[PDB]
Amino acid sequence: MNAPDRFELFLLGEGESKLKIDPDTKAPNAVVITFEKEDHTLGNLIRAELLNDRKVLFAAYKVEHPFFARFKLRIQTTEGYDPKDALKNACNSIINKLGALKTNFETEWNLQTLA
Amino acid sequence: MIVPVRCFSCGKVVGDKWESYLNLLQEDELDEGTALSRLGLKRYCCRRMILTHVDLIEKFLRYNPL
Amino acid sequence: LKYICAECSSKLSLSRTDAVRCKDCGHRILLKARTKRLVQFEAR
Amino acid sequence: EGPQVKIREASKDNVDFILSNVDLAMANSLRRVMIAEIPTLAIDSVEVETNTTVLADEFIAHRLGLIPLQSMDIEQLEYSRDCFCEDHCDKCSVVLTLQAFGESESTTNVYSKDLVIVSNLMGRNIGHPIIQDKEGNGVLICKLRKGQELKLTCVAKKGIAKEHAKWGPAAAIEFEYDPWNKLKHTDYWYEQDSAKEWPQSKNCEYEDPPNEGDPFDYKAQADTFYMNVESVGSIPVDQVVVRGIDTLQKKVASILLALTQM
Ligand SMILES: [Zn+2]
Ligand SMILES: [Zn+2]
Ligand SMILES: [Zn+2]
C-alpha cells in the first residue's frame, strides 16, 4: 500500500526545494514556477498584486489537480526587467502592505478597548 | 449518543449547551425556538444540531452491565 | 482474574471447574475479561 | 498609511469590522489563512487504560480530540515533528489525564472541567480547557452509572487546521462587499422585481444607495469589505486576527528568502 495522507498536504519538500525556475521556450522572457505545499491562498494573492504592477505583461496561476498541493505560475514581461525581480518586488509590496494593516489593527483594537 | 461536540458545518462548540437547552424546556415552559435564540445560536447550521439530535445514550444506559 | 460470566464481577480466575456457574450468580455463559494490556489510540 | 481598518463592534468572542484600501485577493487570502493556517494546541493521541462505559472507545478518542484548549502561549513550544526529542517531551507537548467513577446512584456526567494537567506546564498559559458557560461544566463527554470506569492518558500536540478540523480556531467567518451591487458582480434571479424579492443587506446603510439613473460606473473597483470573525474560544479574537496576518506574511517572506537563496 502507498496511498498518501495529509502529511504531504503542506510539509515543504522533503529532499526537495520549495520552487523550480524553468524557462519557457514559447515567448521571450517567460518563466514558469512550480510552488508546492501551497495553493490558492497564496497563488491568487501573488498573481493579483503582480498584475497590479505595471511592468509585467502576463501573470496567471493554475493548480493542476486538487489531489496535489502544487501549483504553477507564468510570468512574462518586457525586456531588461527580469521576471525574478518582478516577483521579488511583488513580495516586498505584499509584506509592506499587510504589515501596515497589522499595525493599524492593533491601534484600533486598543482604541476600541475603552480607556 | 451524546450531543456532538463542534457543529459539523461551522465548528462552534456545542455540548455545553445541551442540558441547558433541556432545562430551558423543563421548568421554564419556554418555546423551543426562542429557547435556542436565548441560548444564543443565531446561525442555523449550528441550530439544526441541537434541534434534531436525539439522545440514545440513556436508553443504552438503562441496562445493568457488570 | 480470567472470566466474568455475568452482571456479577466474579473474577473466576479459572483453571478448570471452579463452579463456572458462579457463586453469587447462576449464569453459565462465561464472558472473558478485557485485558490489562495497554492499548493505543489515535484521535485524528 | 495604507489599508485602514474600522471596528464596528466587539465582544469576548467575535469581532466585526470594516476593511478599506485593500484588494480582493488580499481580503480573501486573509480569510482563508484565518480559517486554515493558525497554529494552536489540541489533544491528539490517547491511551485507554481502562474503559467500561457503554460509550465506545473511539468515540471517547474522537470526542476528546475536539475539546478546545487554552492556547495563548502556543508560540513558546514547538512541533513534535521538528522537536529534538522523541516521545512527547515537555518542550514539545503536554499531557492530560482523566478520572471517572460511577459513584452515585443516579447517572454521573463527565465534563471537560475534570481532565487535569499533569506534566510540567513550565509557567506558560497552555492547555486548560475552556469553560464558556457560567456554570462551571465544560463540554459534556460521557455518562456513567454505578460501575463504569474511565482512565485516560492524553497527549496534546501542535497541529494546524489544514490537516484536521481539530486544530481550528476559526469556527465561522463572514464576508461581504458591495452590498448594493454597484459593481454588478451578480444579477438577481427574480420574477417580478429584484428589489422587491430580495431582502436588503444589513450592511446597506453604510454606503449610499445607487442614486437611480446614473450610468454604469465601469471604471470602479471593489473595496470596503465587511468581515465578522467569530472564534471558538481557544484563543482571543484579536489574537486570531493578528496571528493570521502574521502567518500570511511569514509565508510570503519565506517564499522570498527561498527565492533569494536560490
Ligand atoms: Zn454550525
Ligand atoms: Zn455471574
Ligand atoms: Zn519534544
Residue ranges of domains in chain C: 2-44
Q: Is C10 helix (H, G, I), strand (E, B) or coil?
A: coil
Q: Does B40 touch chain C (CB under 8 A)?
A: no
Architecture, CATH, for domain C2-44: Single Sheet (2.20)
Q: Do D23 and D46 lie in a common domain?
A: no
Segments forming the whole domain that contains residue A75: 1-115
Which of these, D203, D55, D132, D248, lies nearest to B56 by C-alpha position?
D55
Distance D151 CA to ligand 3 centre (A): 24
Phi first, then psi: give them for residue B60, nearest 5 degrees. Answer: -65, -40
- Which amino acid, one-letter code, is at D50? T
Q: Are D249 and A99 in contact (CB under 8 A)?
A: yes
D168 contacts on B by Cβ (under 8 Å)? 11
Kindly identify which residue of chain C lies nearest to residue B66, measuring between CA atoms: C7
What experimental approach yielded this model? cryo-EM
Strand partners, A19: A35
Q: Which residue on chain D is closest to C35 by alpha carbon?
A: D50
Helix (H) or strand (E) holding A60: strand A56-62
- Together in a domain, D67 and D7: no
* Helix, strand or coil, per DSSP, at residue A50: helix
Judged by its nearest atom, the ligand closest to the C-alpha of residue B13 is 1
Structurally, chain B folds into a number of domains equal to: 1
Closest CA to B57 of C43, D59, D129, D132: D59
Q: Which helix (H) or strand (E) holds D55?
A: none
Q: With CA atoms as reference, report the closest residue to A73 among A93, A87, A94.
A: A87
Contacts of D67 by beta carbon, 8 Å cutoff, 6+ apart: B5, D42, D43, D112, D129, D138, D139
Rounded Cα gap, residues D242 and D247, in angstroms: 9
Quick one: D87 and D31 in the same domain? Answer: no
* Lateral strand order in the sheet of D149-157: D42-51, D149-157, D94-101, D116-117
Burial of D109 (0-12, 13-18, 19+ CB in 10 A): middle
What single-letter amino acid sits at C42?
A: E
What CATH number is associated with residue D226? 3.30.1360.10
CATH number at residue D76: 2.170.120.12
Which residue in chain C is spatially nearest to B65 when comparing CA positions?
A: C7
Chains adjacent to B (≥3 CB pairs closer than 8 angstroms): C, D
d(CA D51, CA D23): 54
Domain coverage including residue D227 = 1-39+166-262
Q: Helix B18-26 and helix B32-39: axis angle, to 10°?
A: 140
CA distance D66 to chain B (A): 7
- Domain, as residue range, for B11: 1-66
Bridge partners, residue A22, by sequence: A32
**Contacts of residue D114 in chain B, CB cutoff 8 Å?**
none
The answer to whether D61 faces chain C, any CB pair under 8 Å, is yes
CB D133 within 8 A of CB B20: yes
User: Distance between CA atoms of B29 and D77, rounded to whole angstroms?
Assistant: 49
Q: Return the ∠ at Cα D173 (arms to D171 and D179), rounded to 5°.
A: 160
In chain D, the number of structural domains is 2
Helices H / strands E in chain C, number of each: 0, 0
User: CA-to-CA distance for A111 and D7, rounded, in angstroms?
Assistant: 10
What does the alpha-carbon distance between residue A76 and residue A27 come to, in Å, rounded to a whole number?
A: 8
Q: Give whole-number Cα distances, D79 to B7, D85, D93, D156, D196, in Å.
A: 27, 10, 8, 11, 55
- Distance from first CA to last CA of chain C, Å, rounded? 34
Total domains present in chain A: 1
Angle at D32 between CA D182 and CA D241, to 5 degrees: 95
User: Which of D140, D165, D190 delimits the end of a domain?
Assistant: D165
Contacts of D35 (CB under 8 A, 6+ apart): D161, D168, D170, D173
CB contact at 8 A, D211 and D6: no
Task: Report chain B's terminal Cα–Cα distance, integer Å.
Answer: 20
D85-to-A15, D80, D118 alpha-carbon distances in Å = 22, 8, 19
Q: Are residues D44 and D95 in the same domain?
A: yes
Domain of residue A74, CATH code = 3.30.1360.10
Kindly provide the residue ranges of all beta strands, DSSP E only, lying in chain D, ordered along the sequence.
5-10, 14-19, 42-51, 69-71, 94-101, 108-111, 116-117, 126-129, 140-144, 149-157, 173-176, 225-230
Which H helix or E strand runs over D158?
none
B-chain CB neighbours of D67 within 8 Å are 5
Q: Which three cell numbers stand for residue D87?
A: 516521545
Name D229's bridge partners. Answer: D15, D173
Q: The CATH number of the domain where B26 resides is what?
A: 1.10.10.60
| Selected residues 231-260 of chain D with any CB under 8 Å from a CB in chain A | 238, 241-242, 245-246, 248-249, 251-256, 258-260
